[PDB]
């Protein structure tokens, strides 16, 4: 279900309406999913870069690369969080 377009619930009638427990749970899952997807995408991009620069071509190369792999990513999309997460491919 990482194909699924992420959207917060449309059930609350207005911006200040208290969420039902169902809606709160639903929105929590959507929030966390979006953050996770963006983090995965940026980390994979970093990994591709690191791999391409290293160009491992033996198991020994790969053992070495694993030892130095330290990938740092930040998710910071503000109000565009879901839009950005939905735009992702693969």
């Amino acid at each position: 279900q990482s194909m699924r377009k992420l959207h917060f619930s449309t059930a609350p009638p207005n911006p200040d309406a208290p969420w039902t427990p169902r809606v709160a749970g639903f929105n929590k899952r959507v929030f966390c999913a979006a953050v996770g997807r963006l983090a995965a995408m940026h980390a994979r991009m970093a990994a591709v870069q690191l791999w391409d620069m290293s160009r491992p071509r033996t198991d020994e190369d790969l053992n070495e690369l694993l030892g130095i792999t330290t990938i740092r990513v930040t998710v910071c999309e503000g109000k565009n969080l879901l839009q950005r997460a939905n735009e992702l491919v693969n």
Binding site: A46, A47, T74, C76
Partner: peptide
Amino acid sequence: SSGVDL
């Protein structure tokens, strides 16, 4: 958002 290797 961003991602980089050390």
